[PDB]
Structure 1
Amino acid sequence: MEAIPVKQFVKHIGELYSNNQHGFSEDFEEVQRCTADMNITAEHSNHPENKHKNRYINILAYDHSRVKLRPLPSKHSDYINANYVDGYNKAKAYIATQGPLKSTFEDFWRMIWEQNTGIIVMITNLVEKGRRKCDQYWPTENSEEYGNIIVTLKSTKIHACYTVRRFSIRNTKQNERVVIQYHYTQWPDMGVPEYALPVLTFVRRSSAARMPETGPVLVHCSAGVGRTGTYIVIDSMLQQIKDKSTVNVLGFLKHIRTQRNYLVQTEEQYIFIHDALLEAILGK
């Protein structure tokens, strides 16, 4: 698993695709197996106090990488279902977390403050195909207050495929910060995504909005593993292309898989990653 030179990567996509995507299948099987001889603890996620704080029972936050809330004047007020994840040539470039529940909106915005996050990437619709994916954690208009964080909507731009919301937030404790949410909104009534270019532009633009010397980028979908992982791998790999002109999708995914369970949750997503990077390379 050395990196693949960028000039041969589309060639390599051809081979993975061939014979009914046999190659993609071997690769993703390898990914799902690369936890085999690996026990990773998530005791906090499984604790009775913390259970109502998880959206899905089997989607947990690994202890070692979990984001810790500063505790409040109770022994578990430090928990949120969220993990730090690496970007390219950087550690904890991301926080990958579940879409926040009613009962965890306070924790969610607290984490945002404590971690000094300045960019949100939302990769779900609140509802999709009739099933609830995420409860709305920001104000429809003007201000809303969550715990000691007051969130104010300042600005919105709605594009074909995603929406950009510029919030201003303040800690009641005077000190204020700009936080921008990139929301990918375009979701099929049936099936799943199928052209990667719109996602590639969403990623390029959201990744570019990151400010130097800020905290990690928050990335969530519903469960916070599938599309969250897809974003992360595609972003990291454009970075790597830009810097070294090489690609290592398989190596990097194996790695961040130790940092949060089930990142990139399906083969179709694993294929989509390649399609995005293909668009980015042919596009140049």
Structure 2
Amino acid sequence: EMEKEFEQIDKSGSWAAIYQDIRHEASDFPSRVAKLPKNKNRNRYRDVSPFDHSRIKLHQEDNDYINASLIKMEEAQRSYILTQGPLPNTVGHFWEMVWEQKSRGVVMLNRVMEKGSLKCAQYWPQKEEKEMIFEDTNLKLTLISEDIKSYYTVRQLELENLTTQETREILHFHYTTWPDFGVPESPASFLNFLFKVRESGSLSPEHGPVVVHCSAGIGRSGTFCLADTCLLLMDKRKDPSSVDIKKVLLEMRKFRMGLIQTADQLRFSYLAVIEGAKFIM
């Protein structure tokens, strides 16, 4: 059981070394569409690109590019869209993707400002009475209700397709307490947040894939969908020990580069999964 492997890596302090093996073993696939010069202003970081094979395509015929990847975990029957925090000029694209993919939830793992810089556009309304219209994509977005708690906020949004007058209810799950530097001391609140998302049905196969992001959509977003997938495989399987967090992470990396940015995030994922199991007993 990984619990023993955890103590071993921890007692030897081999985390940086484990992490480097994963870096070296990780897939590399073309990302030609991301690097086209017409798409330069659709990427927040020049070194974080979706692979062409797993990129989400917008159904607008002009330019179908968005920095988003579909991560399909076949065994766990789970899918996720990892994307970057939208830019001022991609908020309309972001909501179009949510519409086109029939997503039920958006999980946000960053504050709009961290380290005194902007990590993300304000892409949802702040007040009931002040809805947002995206002109470029013919979508209207309305805050319905907002439920602020210590570690996270849940918002009920209405997304209206102005073209067809269809409306959908979107859930916004905003983990608001990820520290500016490093990782939470305890995974307790992250695990509570994860289950809250599960309970909503946002991760369920009767809906399009959940959209998950931080600023880049590889670090904290990686930790979210690594933990969800590992915990799900632990119920699914005859034998728990089978599930190897390093194998699951490398399988996820075939879909999006860089998932889990630091050895700290690797250690924290182990801790979340180990603790997360401990709540099954």
The alignment covers a number of residue pairs equal to: 270
Match of 2:194 in 1: 203
CA contact (8 A) 2:155 2:173 kept: yes
1:265 is aligned with what amino acid?
Q
Measure the CA separation in 1 of the matches of 2:4 and 2:78. 32
Q: How does 1:1-284 map to 2 (within 5 A)?
A: 8-20=1-13, 22=14, 24-35=15-26, 39-72=28-61, 74=62, 77-87=63-73, 89-90=75-76, 93-142=79-128, 143-146=131-134, 147-173=137-163, 174-188=165-179, 191-209=182-200, 210=202, 211-244=204-237, 245-246=240-241, 247-283=243-279, 284=281
1:12 is aligned with what amino acid?
E
1:64 is aligned with what amino acid?
H
Deviation at 1:277, TM superposition (A): 1.4
Deviation at 1:175, TM superposition (A): 0.9
Measure the CA separation in 1 of the matches of 2:148 and 2:271. 25
TM-score (normalised: structure 1)? 0.90
Deviation at 1:239, TM superposition (A): 0.6
Match of 1:5 in 2: none
| Deviation by residue 1:60-107 (Cα, 9 ceiling, x = unmatched) | 1110000000123x3xx1000000002462567100000000100111
CA contact (8 A) 1:84 1:92 kept: no
Deviation at 1:191, TM superposition (A): 4.3
CA contact (8 A) 1:98 1:222 kept: yes
TM-score (normalised: structure 2)? 0.91
Deviation at 1:205, TM superposition (A): 1.4
Q: CA RMSD in A?
A: 1.6
| Deviant stretches of 4+, over 4 Å | none
CA contact (8 A) 2:51 2:255 kept: yes
More moved, 156-165 vs 190-199? 190-199
Measure the CA separation in 1 of the matches of 2:42 and 2:124. 18
| Deviation by residue 1:140-189 (Cα, 9 ceiling, x = unmatched) | 11311123111111111111101101101110112111100100001335
Percent identity (aligned): 35
- Listed as ranges, the gaps of 5+ residues in structure 2 are none
- Listed as ranges, the gaps of 5+ residues in structure 1 are 1-7
Deviation at 1:9, TM superposition (A): 2.6
